[PDB]
Design a protein around this nucleic acid. Structure first.
Ligand SMILES: [Mg+2]
Ligand SMILES: [Mg+2]
Ligand SMILES: [Mg+2]
Ligand SMILES: [Mg+2]
Ligand SMILES: [Mg+2]
Ligand SMILES: [Mg+2]
Ligand SMILES: [Mg+2]
Ligand SMILES: [Mg+2]
Ligand SMILES: [Mg+2]
Ligand SMILES: [Mg+2]
Ligand SMILES: [Mg+2]
Ligand SMILES: [Mg+2]
Ligand SMILES: [Mg+2]
Ligand SMILES: [Mg+2]
Ligand SMILES: [Mg+2]
Ligand SMILES: [Mg+2]
Ligand SMILES: [Mg+2]
Ligand SMILES: [Mg+2]
Ligand SMILES: [Mg+2]
Ligand SMILES: [Mg+2]
Ligand SMILES: [Mg+2]
Ligand SMILES: [Mg+2]
Ligand SMILES: [Mg+2]
Ligand SMILES: [Mg+2]
Ligand SMILES: [Mg+2]
Ligand SMILES: [Mg+2]
Ligand SMILES: [Mg+2]
Ligand SMILES: [Mg+2]
Ligand SMILES: [Mg+2]
Ligand SMILES: [Mg+2]
Ligand SMILES: [Mg+2]
Ligand SMILES: [Mg+2]
Ligand SMILES: [Mg+2]
Ligand SMILES: [Mg+2]
Ligand SMILES: [Mg+2]
Ligand SMILES: [Mg+2]
Ligand SMILES: [Mg+2]
Ligand SMILES: [Mg+2]
Ligand SMILES: [Mg+2]
Ligand SMILES: [Mg+2]
Ligand SMILES: [Mg+2]
Ligand SMILES: [Mg+2]
Ligand SMILES: [Mg+2]
Ligand SMILES: [Mg+2]
Ligand SMILES: [Mg+2]
Ligand SMILES: [Mg+2]
Ligand SMILES: [Mg+2]
Ligand SMILES: [Mg+2]
Ligand SMILES: [Mg+2]
Ligand SMILES: [Mg+2]
Ligand SMILES: [Mg+2]
Ligand SMILES: [Mg+2]
Ligand SMILES: [Mg+2]
Ligand SMILES: [Mg+2]
Ligand SMILES: [Mg+2]
Ligand SMILES: [Mg+2]
Ligand SMILES: [Mg+2]
Ligand SMILES: [Mg+2]
Ligand SMILES: [Mg+2]
Ligand SMILES: [Mg+2]
Ligand SMILES: [Mg+2]
Ligand SMILES: [Mg+2]
Ligand SMILES: [Mg+2]
Ligand SMILES: [Mg+2]
Ligand SMILES: [Mg+2]
Ligand SMILES: [Mg+2]
Ligand SMILES: [Mg+2]
Ligand SMILES: [Mg+2]
Ligand SMILES: [Mg+2]
Ligand SMILES: [Mg+2]
Ligand SMILES: [Mg+2]
Ligand SMILES: [Mg+2]
Ligand SMILES: [Mg+2]
Ligand SMILES: [Mg+2]
Ligand SMILES: [Mg+2]
Ligand SMILES: [Mg+2]
Ligand SMILES: [Mg+2]
Ligand SMILES: [Mg+2]
Ligand SMILES: [Mg+2]
Ligand SMILES: [Mg+2]
Ligand SMILES: [Mg+2]
Ligand SMILES: [Mg+2]
Ligand SMILES: [Mg+2]
Ligand SMILES: [Mg+2]
Ligand SMILES: [Mg+2]
Ligand SMILES: [Mg+2]
Ligand SMILES: [Mg+2]
Ligand SMILES: [Mg+2]
Ligand SMILES: [Mg+2]
Ligand SMILES: [Mg+2]
Ligand SMILES: [Mg+2]
Ligand SMILES: [Mg+2]
Ligand SMILES: [Mg+2]
Ligand SMILES: [Mg+2]
Ligand SMILES: [Mg+2]
Ligand SMILES: [Mg+2]
Ligand SMILES: [Mg+2]
Ligand SMILES: [Mg+2]
Ligand SMILES: [Mg+2]
Ligand SMILES: [Mg+2]
Ligand SMILES: [Mg+2]
Ligand SMILES: [Mg+2]
Ligand SMILES: [Mg+2]
Ligand SMILES: [Mg+2]
Ligand SMILES: [Mg+2]
Ligand SMILES: [Mg+2]
Ligand SMILES: [Mg+2]
Ligand SMILES: [Mg+2]
Ligand SMILES: [Mg+2]
Ligand SMILES: [Mg+2]
Lengths: 205, 112, 61, 87, 81, 80
RNA sequence: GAACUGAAGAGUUUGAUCAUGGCUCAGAUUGAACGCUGGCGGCAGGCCUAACACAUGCAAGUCGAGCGGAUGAAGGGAGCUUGCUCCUGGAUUCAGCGGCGGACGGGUGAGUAAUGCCUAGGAAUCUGCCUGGUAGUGGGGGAUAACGUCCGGAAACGGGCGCUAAUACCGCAUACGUCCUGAGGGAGAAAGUGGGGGAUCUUCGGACCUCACGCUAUCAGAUGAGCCUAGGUCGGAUUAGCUAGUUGGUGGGGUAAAGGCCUACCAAGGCGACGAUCCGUAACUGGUCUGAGAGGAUGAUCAGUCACACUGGAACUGAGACACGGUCCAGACUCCUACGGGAGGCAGCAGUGGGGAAUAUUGGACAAUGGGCGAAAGCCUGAUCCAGCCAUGCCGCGUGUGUGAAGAAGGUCUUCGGAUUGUAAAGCACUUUAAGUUGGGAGGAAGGGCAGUAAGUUAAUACCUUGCUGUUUUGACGUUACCAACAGAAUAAGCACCGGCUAACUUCGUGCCAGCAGCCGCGGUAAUACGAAGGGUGCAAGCGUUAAUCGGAAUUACUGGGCGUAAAGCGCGCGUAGGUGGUUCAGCAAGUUGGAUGUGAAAUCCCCGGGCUCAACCUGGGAACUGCAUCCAAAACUACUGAGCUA
């Protein structure tokens, strides 16, 4: 399945940016993002350790739009690997095909990139892949189907990716709308406020 | 279930209005669906103002263990119209004091 | 055995075929089982709209 | 039996049983003659019976009625008994 | 007798085969004495179509093992390559 | 070559056969303490030269009677 | 270079505290069931209960190149005349004898506590078909099925009377091996078919040569099986004695083979607190699930072994059976009957009734892999490969995307200002995954038939075997996987919870009622705990409840607990089996340690990879399987042996 519905409620509940709109105008002037959603928005209501762990895990899940069972799978495979499962989890989550397409800049949001992937418009190594979970390997050359390169959405999102901060680990050729995924980003490159140790503590229980 | 509830309501109201009745409980097993309804219709007006007959369980086919122990539970007379009992039903009937009878004409059932 | 009937109303009478499940009622001494609503002859509660899966109630629609 | 091949097999089995019983009895009586001659101390009769009985034992062992180790054991034991008796 | 045949693994519509030496009166996927290779009908990519251990095959042939028709064809196919 | 066992004679009242007791130490599977187990074997002694208490050695052969499949090879210690 | 790296606590006894101690909760798992809800696909799974009873179909046949026989086309034609008759031959099919197969493959877990299973070994055995060798396959005889006749029967079919073949059966000769015997010697086999042919003799029916198949004797090898030993394998002592073919010996019998396996004598032995006997329960293992591990629980699916085939016995045939769709005897239970008389065994695949909370189609094909027969085409195959049904499980994907503030209308709350539902909706603009329609379209396929060619085969360009060439021919699944085009946002969200444990709060009804509840506990007029409504929180084609196992439980404590007062030192001695042992030398190598070799099935779990667009799934190699057994070496400690010493 997939979460469909209001997307500014999640930002208000988590209390942070949690990029879910196109980012065109702003985030503050659409949802007054300083109250928790619902009737009792003004109450502060500090929360326990379990609440903090749950909020962190839910925040990560709500940013990539992954449900609970697939998150369990990702966590299990990350723990099975070597080298600090906490950062292996983000290493794994950054290699998803929809996330890669979003980073390359062919989609306004994660959901838009997911629909680009699902609707048979993205080819990974020169053949169509429509699974928004395909782990992109380093060196793969993602592209767009020639019959769909003149869609207004990709061109519109190209400049938005132009001004959002350089990722500096993928490359893109704009004329042919074709890019290369050099390598999965290091833990430093990602936002150093997602404290994954809370996730590890929550699941190891 | 709705019909059972409504019939229970009507029976409770009638019993409250009149008094009490003595019920003869019957388990009835026939061979064909057509005979069962005729037997049930004939066994409706046979009662009186103090004693009535109630079919606690019907069915089509031979007499089994389930209806035998249902008759045991309800203290009911077991009737088989053109049907027989298998080994389990026979065992249950012989072990206890259940009385079960065979008929091929409905008027024998009416007289009994 | 003895079973407990949940919900506000019920239609059980003599010789009613019922299904029972586990679960002890703390207040009643000797009651160790629960009657499943809406399975064989219990029909479940009516006019119930919150959590109406433990009481065998269809979706109001 | 239901399949015709089973009926045919049963008929053949009865035929071969009737055939085999006579041969088994032949071997048994030829051995019994030697044994009862030995029990009676009739030496010359014992050699006569042994020489009369060895060929039929070997023949019927070859035909498959009895196994060859059985025939070898019978021959060896009878020869040993006769040799001990002669002395 | 002792025969060399194919034991089917794989999955639905995607067969995989094990070259197996068995007593003839066993289930297709039951007891065996030795496996001496495999054969992949689909193969594709980096997979190999079939592989055979020559020494074991020759040893079992010299002991009187009787290959099946498909195995008889595959053995000389492997020898040719 | 051939594997043997060594034990002590505990009964010789049968004819041309003897009973020999063999001791062994086994580690307890869970508690880890070594405990003594024993075996009582019947060995074939053709010439009746064994007495109670004799330390003897035996080897395994084909069965010679029911519950008798061992025969002794040497007497290494004689009862006082 | 990897094969692992891993361990949380909380609530509840009191006015409060610390401890002890039980109860309960948070996790992971099912062959699950039930309630509410329900779009698709891939891969698996699906009577755990009555080893209860079974209607109807199918699940084991094949060989005419072993043998008689009867059905005998096409034709050569002839005759009369266009219809028929007949001679000649003869291509097909098989009721019967005969050879193989039916002991496999498939099902179930009743019995079994040891004649089973697991680990490691050994010696006294057999083994059809297969491979390699060696010696052969000579010559005769008597029967019999089928087939004609008579009788009997409701029929099934039975009985009596004559004739005929074989690779059916039985004598005789011969023996590289084989049997026994002592060297001396004696004993024991076979079967012939099909395709060609130069020469020789003939009735070119044939003999004869060759090839292929087959048959006999024996050795070796593989495969399978039988037998033996040691260790291990659930609970109970409120089960302490058990055993007379019983334990050993001799003579004999018997078996493929050792053996009280059997028998006649001789002796009085054998087993047991290291648990015999008895009672209850139960197929075992690889494995599975939990756990940081040590452990605990457990033997669905898959693989190995065992046992069973309505109940109790028994043997025959056979290389192999005490025989799952075979025989005989007895029993219980159904059924047919013309009343005299016979038949039956779904724990094979579908299916029915019944029992149950509960578990599916009277489907397709032998196309692929195997199995039986055949020489070869080929025939059979409910094995198998595939389809049908069921959210039963695991995995994946959809139910749209962006913009959008009059912060619309409505609902809800309010301090009546407003807040919230909420960019959520509407509006505006995009896209068509999956499903729908249409057109293309692999891979699972190796082979078989025919003709020619080249080698070898002999004695021979023949037949035959093999290479190659050319032509033809094969798919249940299947409207395959997949690819492309078309219209449109259209076809597709629910369940539980919100007092603490535990993430999520306010109103309105009701008033110790109705009710809730895993544990504390709520409800008697402002209930965040009952029932609704708004809001929110978790999951999501699922969500909850019930049942069950392990964890948390260090709460049976080996790792890893205790006994003055919380449970817990026998009233006190003596002493048997057992456990443990002051201090020196010397030896031995059972324990101990190190090494080598064999084994520890495959699958599964773990690591590195390879394929299906990903994953589940499949698959290559490795690691592991912590065990057992045999050899070699060491001598500190324990054990054993000899000699000491005095704490
Ligand atoms: Mg899912
Ligand atoms: Mg409960
Ligand atoms: Mg036959
Ligand atoms: Mg012979
Ligand atoms: Mg099998
Ligand atoms: Mg099996
Ligand atoms: Mg024995
Ligand atoms: Mg406590
Ligand atoms: Mg208190
Ligand atoms: Mg329930
Ligand atoms: Mg339901
Ligand atoms: Mg429902
Ligand atoms: Mg069963
Ligand atoms: Mg049943
Ligand atoms: Mg058939
Ligand atoms: Mg032939
Ligand atoms: Mg025939
Ligand atoms: Mg058998
Ligand atoms: Mg059998
Ligand atoms: Mg078998
Ligand atoms: Mg099965
Ligand atoms: Mg069983
Ligand atoms: Mg069972
Ligand atoms: Mg017992
Ligand atoms: Mg055995
Ligand atoms: Mg074993
Ligand atoms: Mg013959
Ligand atoms: Mg002769
Ligand atoms: Mg002859
Ligand atoms: Mg066997
Ligand atoms: Mg044993
Ligand atoms: Mg015991
Ligand atoms: Mg005696
Ligand atoms: Mg003896
Ligand atoms: Mg003897
Ligand atoms: Mg004896
Ligand atoms: Mg005992
Ligand atoms: Mg049992
Ligand atoms: Mg633990
Ligand atoms: Mg474990
Ligand atoms: Mg584990
Ligand atoms: Mg067990
Ligand atoms: Mg099974
Ligand atoms: Mg097996
Ligand atoms: Mg075994
Ligand atoms: Mg087996
Ligand atoms: Mg065995
Ligand atoms: Mg068996
Ligand atoms: Mg059966
Ligand atoms: Mg049955
Ligand atoms: Mg029987
Ligand atoms: Mg018999
Ligand atoms: Mg007989
Ligand atoms: Mg025999
Ligand atoms: Mg058997
Ligand atoms: Mg059989
Ligand atoms: Mg049987
Ligand atoms: Mg069997
Ligand atoms: Mg059967
Ligand atoms: Mg019989
Ligand atoms: Mg009888
Ligand atoms: Mg009977
Ligand atoms: Mg049956
Ligand atoms: Mg069945
Ligand atoms: Mg069964
Ligand atoms: Mg049923
Ligand atoms: Mg039922
Ligand atoms: Mg069901
Ligand atoms: Mg089934
Ligand atoms: Mg086939
Ligand atoms: Mg034919
Ligand atoms: Mg069929
Ligand atoms: Mg499905
Ligand atoms: Mg359900
Ligand atoms: Mg299911
Ligand atoms: Mg308003
Ligand atoms: Mg489509
Ligand atoms: Mg093809
Ligand atoms: Mg099409
Ligand atoms: Mg809270
Ligand atoms: Mg509630
Ligand atoms: Mg109130
Ligand atoms: Mg609550
Ligand atoms: Mg409430
Ligand atoms: Mg529920
Ligand atoms: Mg539960
Ligand atoms: Mg439980
Ligand atoms: Mg539970
Ligand atoms: Mg514990
Ligand atoms: Mg517990
Ligand atoms: Mg602990
Ligand atoms: Mg301790
Ligand atoms: Mg304690
Ligand atoms: Mg103490
Ligand atoms: Mg006290
Ligand atoms: Mg004391
Ligand atoms: Mg004291
Ligand atoms: Mg005392
Ligand atoms: Mg005492
Ligand atoms: Mg005392
Ligand atoms: Mg006292
Ligand atoms: Mg003392
Ligand atoms: Mg002592
Ligand atoms: Mg000492
Ligand atoms: Mg000592
Ligand atoms: Mg010393
Ligand atoms: Mg060692
Ligand atoms: Mg293994
Ligand atoms: Mg891959
Ligand atoms: Mg030394």
């Amino acid at each position: 399945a997939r979460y469909i519905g209001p997307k500014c409620k999640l930002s208000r509940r988590e209390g942070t940016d949690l990029f879910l709109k196109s980012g065109a105008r702003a985030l503050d002037s659409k949802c007054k993002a300083e109250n928790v959603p619902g009737q009792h928005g003004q109450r502060r209501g500090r929360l326990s350790d379990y609440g903090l762990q749950l909020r962190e895990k839910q925040k990560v899940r709500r940013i990539y739009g992954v449900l609970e069972r697939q998150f369990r799978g990702y966590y299990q495979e990350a723990s099975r690997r070597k080298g600090s499962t906490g950062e292996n989890l983000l290493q794994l989550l950054e290699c998803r095909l929809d996330n890669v397409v979003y980073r390359m800049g062919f989609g306004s949001t994660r959901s838009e990139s997911r629909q680009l992937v699902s609707h048979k418009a993205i080819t990974v190594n020169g053949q169509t892949v429509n699974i928004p979970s395909y782990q992109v390997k380093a060196g793969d050359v993602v592209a767009v189907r020639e019959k769909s390169k003149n869609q207004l959405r990709i061109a519109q999102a190209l400049e938005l990716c132009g001004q959002r901060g350089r990722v500096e680990w993928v490359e893109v050729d704009l004329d042919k709308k074709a890019g290369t995924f050099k390598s999965a980003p290091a833990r430093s490159d990602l936002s150093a406020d997602i404290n994954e140790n809370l996730i590890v503590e929550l699941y190891s229980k | 279930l709705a019909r059972a509830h409504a019939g229970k309501l009507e029976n409770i109201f009638e019993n409250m209005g009149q008094e009490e009745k003595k019920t003869l409980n019957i388990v009835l097993k026939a061979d064909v669906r057509g005979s069962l309804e005729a037997l049930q219709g004939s066994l409706s007006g046979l009662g009186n103002d103090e004693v009535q007959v109630r079919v606690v369980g019907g069915g089509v086919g031979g007499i089994t263990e389930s209806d035998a122990n249902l008759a045991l539970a309800s203290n009911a007379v077991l009737f088989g119209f053109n049907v027989r009992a298998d080994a389990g039903a026979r065992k249950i009937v012989e072990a206890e004091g259940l009385d079960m009878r065979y008929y091929n004409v409905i008027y024998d059932i009416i007289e009994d | 055995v003895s079973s407990y009937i949940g919900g506000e109303g019920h239609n059980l009478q003599e010789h009613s075929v019922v299904l029972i499940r586990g679960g002890r009622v703390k207040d009643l001494p000797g009651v160790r089982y629960h009657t499943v609503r809406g399975s064989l002859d219990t029909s479940g509660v009516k006019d119930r709209k919150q959590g109406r899966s433990k009481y065998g109630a269809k979706r109001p629609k | 039996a239901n399949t015709p091949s089973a009926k045919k097999r049963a008929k053949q089995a009865e035929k071969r049983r009737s055939h085999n019983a006579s041969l088994r009895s032949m071997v048994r009586t030829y051995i019994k003659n030697v044994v009862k001659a030995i029990d009676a101390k009739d030496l010359e009769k014992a050699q006569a019976a042994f020489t009369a009985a060895v060929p039929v034992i070997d023949r019927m062992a070859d035909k498959g009625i009895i196994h060859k180790n059985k025939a070898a054991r019978h021959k060896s034991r009878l020869s040993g008994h006769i040799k001990a008796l002669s002395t | 007798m002792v025969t060399i045949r194919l034991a089917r693994g794989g999955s639905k519509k995607r067969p995989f085969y094990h070259l197996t030496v068995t007593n003839s009166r066993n289930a297709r996927d039951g007891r065996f004495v030795e496996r001496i290779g495999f054969f992949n009908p689909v193969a594709t990519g980096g997979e190999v179509r079939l592989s055979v251990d020559q020494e074991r095959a020759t040893y079992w042939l010299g002991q009187g093992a009787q290959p099946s028709e498909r195995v008889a064809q595959l053995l000389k196919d492997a020898a040719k390559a | 070559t051939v594997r043997t066992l060594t034990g002590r004679v505990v009964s010789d009242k049968m004819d041309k056969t003897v009973t020999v007791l063999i001791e062994r130490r086994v580690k307890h599977p869970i508690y880890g303490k070594y405990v003594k187990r024993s075996t009582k074997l019947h060995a074939h002694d053709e010439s009746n030269q064994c007495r109670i208490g004799d330390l003897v050695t035996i080897r395994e052969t084909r069965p010679l009677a029911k519950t008798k499949a061992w025969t002794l090879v040497d007497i290494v210690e004689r009862a006082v």
